[PDB]
Symmetry: C5
Subunit: 23 residues, 5 copies
């Protein structure tokens, strides 16, 4: 579950930069 | 699972402020 | 897992209204 | 877990049509 | 869980191309 929460976190920042460009 | 649902919740609000700027 | 799928569902509609405003 | 991955898939397409309108 | 993280990854890229068009 450790590497599983680390992989989901990566995609998390991927969505962050998303709102950054659209915002 | 407690801290796991608390970490996902944080990102949840992160997406909320997202629709706020785009909306 | 029941309340866990009910909490994720709530955020689900939260994203729905999101595409509604942006769409 | 079967119906759990089928419920998440539904929301998946819900987000797809989202990028479709915004794109 | 292996095929489960591979199915979620697919949708991941699905959201990526999303910010690409909107950005």
């Amino acid at each position: 579950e450790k590497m599983s929460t680390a992989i989901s976190v990566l995609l998390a920042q991927a969505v962050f930069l998303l709102l950054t460009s659209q915002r």
